[PDB]
Each structure stands twice: as structure tokens, then as C-alpha cells.
């Protein structure tokens, strides 16, 4: 009842670059795609105390992870609420990973064949092949993600640090420079993100609260400064639009000054109102 | 008279992980131990024509048969339908031992857990079987 | 890894009145004792991703939960860092319970034989007999505990509600009155405690901040008031001595007004200093 209805990615503890991937009834292991092919909704049944693992496939919407008894094979099939479609999510504490056991037959658990790139059922052992990382899909897509960030008022412009020594942050036309790219990293303890500018090694986007609403890049060797961390909240029904609020004061949102689009326009924080000048597209640099 | 691929009589039972460890009871479990040259490592295999399976009793305890309990362990118990074993011969005297009965609507087999091929102090379990390639489910029956 | 070095009690999901209990190397299942016989330190080995489960027995300090492989027997033996003394703690999410699997053979997990009142082993299944509640020992001891609360300046006196209609709280001499006893309830959602006065049905101890340092009893149907919740922290090297701090502001500790001792002395919240008039013995009403 804390994972219920959550949308997640599932990857292998044995090979963290491999994710559960679904298409047309087949489940395989595949590199990160950051899309619905690797997304799953966990659906809790309180009576069984077990979960269905439903594919977020956009064409077939009723597909769930299914053990093909009596074989050891796994597939996705139409949800009929069968026992071979339910799974126990057992968290290995201290290892931050899950064993996923069949509810139908808990002697058997999911096993990742990293060489065949698929899944089967197996009895238990102490290897990482039966351990899985289950992560909120936003965190999974954004963590360690190198991106450009644009106001939705002008998707041709981006948020940039001015240059290696001018740590100011403004809006400018996209020119593929490293000062215009940010690597997002998630902090598990803080449950919040930092934006590292790629022109510097340890420079993060920061609310300079001792100076009103100013934001600038500053060194991340300021250990316990919440002003350096942000919540990234998806905007409904979009794939790449977010609001970005500050961990120090979550009423404070990343804000394009006045909603102006001119080169050099200030990026700041401002009281959250959720207008279009506080919405951002986070995208792959082309 | 012989009815099958495996003749009636006394066997030692070994795992493929070790030529020097022999199946014997220890308390109420079954495990593979050092050669004792004693009857408790001797197993009487008898074919049952009616069910085309085998029952396997311990020579030191002739009225006790290899069976399985409700906790996943192979046990030594009085005669019952849990004492019927269906071997699949996969090499010269190497067998997978299935329970005659479907368990949880699957084939279940003898299974010994190994740590880097070491099975010392491991109890023999009954676990699901899917094919003939699981090393933890392969056992030697040596006439002796 | 949030469990490393934590001292816990372990009880059965199949019978929540039965706890793991240790004496002279024998482990059994026994009613709640609220003492070291049912306390265990979890010791994480990070390379194994597994735990040793060590008894807090004051007489033999080196005893850990041990599977006597290949038998069905569980006992406590001298720690020799062996595989049959390591355990995977798998938390069943949604169920808020743990499966405890042997590191030596992960196909086998602890099974509570509640009729024999001891532990054995089983392969994995869906029964409640393999599920356990692992809880920090203070919470385990204090949750649903009906107690009297005495300052350490005078154990003969206790914190009481004045009477059923006067909801004020003061110090008075012990007389076994229901207004002198408190039932502690732990709210896992808030990670804090409430003190319920047994003369009322729904009356809890609250810091009414709108009257300064005033603490009284008020309805618990005032939902979102962190003033109605408390942190209870054990005074070091004691058996039943604690300090009690308010949730709203955690430097606000429960305080015997002035350190006075006569009947009717007020009970309040005061800034923490850890002195004798902010310490409290929480005891069984004898
Ligand atoms: O701190 C700037 C602030 O500007 C607001 O937009 C203003 C804008 O400054 C002004 O030029 C215009 O005429 O009216 C707007 C008020 O609605 C933004 O709303 C705010 O988010 C901040 O960006
Ligand atoms: O009012 C609570 C406060 O009282 C202190 O005791 C004081 C006392 O109030 C004061 O009259 C006297 O002159 O000195 C005392 C201290 O030595 C408590 O020490 C303090 O903890 C509070 O509880």
C-alpha cells in the first residue's frame, strides 16, 4: 500500500544497464529507453498481499507479467487476475534491491538471464541474478541524465551558465555548448535532485537566498545547503514538462523572469503559481 | 526379474558435486556425509510395477522410505504415496529423481544446494523441476 | 543498512503475542517480557548482504541465531561468523512483515511453530508462519503499554490528569487512579508517540501552544496537531528512564515545573537541557 499504483522501471542488480522491456506479449532485458516500453504499474491486492505488474504499453493496455506454468518462462498476458499473474515484492534491506517471488508458487522467483537477455523463474540462491532495482520512473529517467532545459514559452532557448567563470544563469539560444547542458543527479537521502552544469566538475544550480530570488551556479562542496537541491515534478499529460521547486522552500519555483524570452533574460526563483513561465522542458540534447 | 532401466537392490546415493559424500539421515533430515561403511548409507531400491515408480528404503531402517514433508524437506517415513519416485536417467548412473505426484501442479525433484560446489551440511530438499540440466538435481546411484 | 546495529524484538505475524526468546542457547517463542531476553542486535555484513542476529543476553554476550544444518533446528551458538549464522531479511512490502531466510540456503526460511513454541525451517510459501515483525525494542516495549509516569526527583509521585472533566495535568501522589495511568500508542505514520489518559476514551496529552508552555489533555479527534505527539528517548545506561520531547518543536521537553515536588506542581513543556526535571521513569502500574 506504498507501492500501490506506482509506476516504476525494473532493472537488474546483476546488470544495472538492463531493464524489463515489454512489447507484444514478450518480456526481455534491454538498455534504458526512458519510455513506456520499460514502465510498469504495480497494482496491490490486499487480500493476497501481492502485486500485479502491469505494462504501460500504449497499444495493449491490459498486459501483466505472467508466469507460464508449468514451464519456467515469463511473458505478459491479458490480465485475468490469475495467481500466476501475482508477485510478492520482497525488499532485501541493506541491499536496496528486490526479490520478486511468484505468488502462485513462492518457491520460485524471477531470475535475470543477462546473456539471453530475458527472464525466467528459478529457485533461490545468493546471486544478484534474482535481485532487481525497482524505481519510480521519473527518478529512473532523470537520474544521471544529461539534458538541456528550456522554458515552454520558447523551446529554442535554454537555461545556461554564462561561462566557466561567470556563474550567473540566464536564458539563451541553444548553441550546443557545455555551459548549456546539465547532468541531473538524484540524492536518495535528501529525496531531491541537483543540476550539475557540464562546463564545471562540481557546480550546481543554486538558489542564492541571501540575495532575494537570485539563482546561480555554485560549488557543491557546500555540503548541507538545501538551497542546492530541487524537486522535479512532472506536469500532467506531458512527457518532458516539469515544474522545479527548491528543497529549502518548496513554495519557491524555478521561474523565467516576467516570462520574457529575450536572450539574457534572468532565471530566478519565485513564489509558485504554476503559470507557463514556471514550466520547463527537460530534454535530450540533439 | 528386471522390469526397468534400474535393477532392484542396494545402492549408495551421491550428488554429482562430490564422489566422496554419501546420502544418510541425520536427525530427521537427509544429508551427504563422509563414507561410514555402515548400513545407514545403504539404500534399497525397489520397483513398483503398478505405478512404474520406485520406493527407496534405508537398509539400517528397512521400514523407513525416502519421502517428503510439508516444509520442503526430503524425509524418512513409513510407506505412503509420497515415497514413490520417478527417476530420469541422464547419464551412466546419473538420475533426476522426480516425485511421482505432481506437487503444486509442477514436477518436483530432489534438490541439493551448493556453495561453489560444496554441499556439506546441506539438507536434501524437494524443489520444482523444469528440465534435465539442473546440477543441483542430479544424483548418482551406485550399486553397492 | 538502516537496520545495522539496531536492537530489536522479533515477533510472529501468525501470533503477535509470541516473541523470539533466548536463554542458555535455546531459542523459543514466548510471551512479551520487555527485557533483554527478547532483544536482538542486527549486525549487517555488507559483502554478504546478510545479518547476524545477536542476543542481548547480559550473561553470554556472544550468542547468535544459528541454523543447526542440516537439521530442522534453530538455536543460539557462539558467533564464529559462519554461513549458518547469517540471515537475509526480506521485507514483504504492503504486508509490513519480514521473511527471514538462511544465508547458507536461501531456499529455507524461519517458520514459527507456535504450537511447539519454537522455530524451524521451511521453503517459501504464502503462510503467516514464515512472516515476522521486526521492531525497534523501545517501540515494541512502549506501544500499547499502560503505564504510570514518575519524575526521577520523586518516584512516589506521578503525572496525572486532575479529573474526568478538568483536563489539566499536574503532579500528584500515586493512588492507582485511572487519571494517573497512561496508555502509550506509537503512530508509525508520524514516527511519534501519544499518551492516552485511561480516565478518558479519546483524550491525549497535548502541548496547547496557544497558551504558551501549557500542557493538558485534549481530544485526539483534533487530527493534525503535532503538539499531540511526542518523542520518547531513553536516558543512557538505564532500564526505565527516558526524556519526552514534543513533536512540533523537538527542543520542547516535558518538564516538571521548577523541579518542585509537592502535590499540584504543574506539568509543562520547556526548552531542553536534559536536567533531572526533564527525565521520567515510565513504569508498569504495580
Ligand atoms: O520577478 C518577476 C515576475 O514577473 C511576473 O510577471 C509580471 C511581469 O514582471 C510584468 O512585466 C508584467 O507586466 O506583469 C507580470 C505579472 O503577472 C511573473 O508572473 C512572475 O512569475 C515573476 O517572473
Ligand atoms: O519554570 C520552569 C523552570 O524552573 C527552573 O527552576 C528555577 C526556578 O524557576 C527559579 O524560580 C529558581 O530561582 O531557579 C530554578 C533553577 O535552579 C528549572 O530549573 C527549569 O528547568 C524550568 O523547569
Question: Which helices and strands, and how do they pair?
Answer:
The complex is a heterotrimer, with two copies of chain A (286 residues) and one copy of chain B (144 residues).
Chain A: E1 7-12, E2 19-23, E3 26-30, E4 40-45, E5 50-55, E6 63-67, E7 74-78, E8 87-92, E9 97-102, E10 109-113, E11 118-122, E12 132-136, H1 137-142, E13 145-151, E14 157-161, E15 169-173, E16 182-187, E17 192-197, E18 203-207, E19 215-219, E20 230-234, E21 241-246, E22 252-256, E23 267-271, E24 280-283
Antiparallel strand pairs in A: 1-4, 1-12, 2-3, 4-5, 6-7, 8-9, 10-11, 13-16, 13-24, 14-15, 16-17, 18-19, 20-21, 21-24, 22-23
Chain B: E1 9-15, E2 21-26, E3 29-34, E4 43-48, E5 53-58, E6 65-68, E7 74-77, E8 85-91, E9 94-99, E10 108-111, E11 125-128, E12 139-143
Antiparallel strand pairs in B: 1-4, 1-12, 2-3, 4-5, 6-7, 8-9, 9-12, 10-11
Our Rg estimate of chain A from Cα atoms comes to 22 Å
Strand order of the main beta sheet of chain B, please? 5-4-1-12-9-8
Main sheet: strand order of chain A: 17-16-13-24-21-20
Quickly count the helices of chain A: 1
Residue share in β-strands of chain A:
over 45%
Shape of chain A: elongated
Q: Which class of chain B in CATH terms?
A: Mainly Beta
The gyration radius over C-alpha positions of chain B equals 14 Å
Count of beta strands of chain A = 24
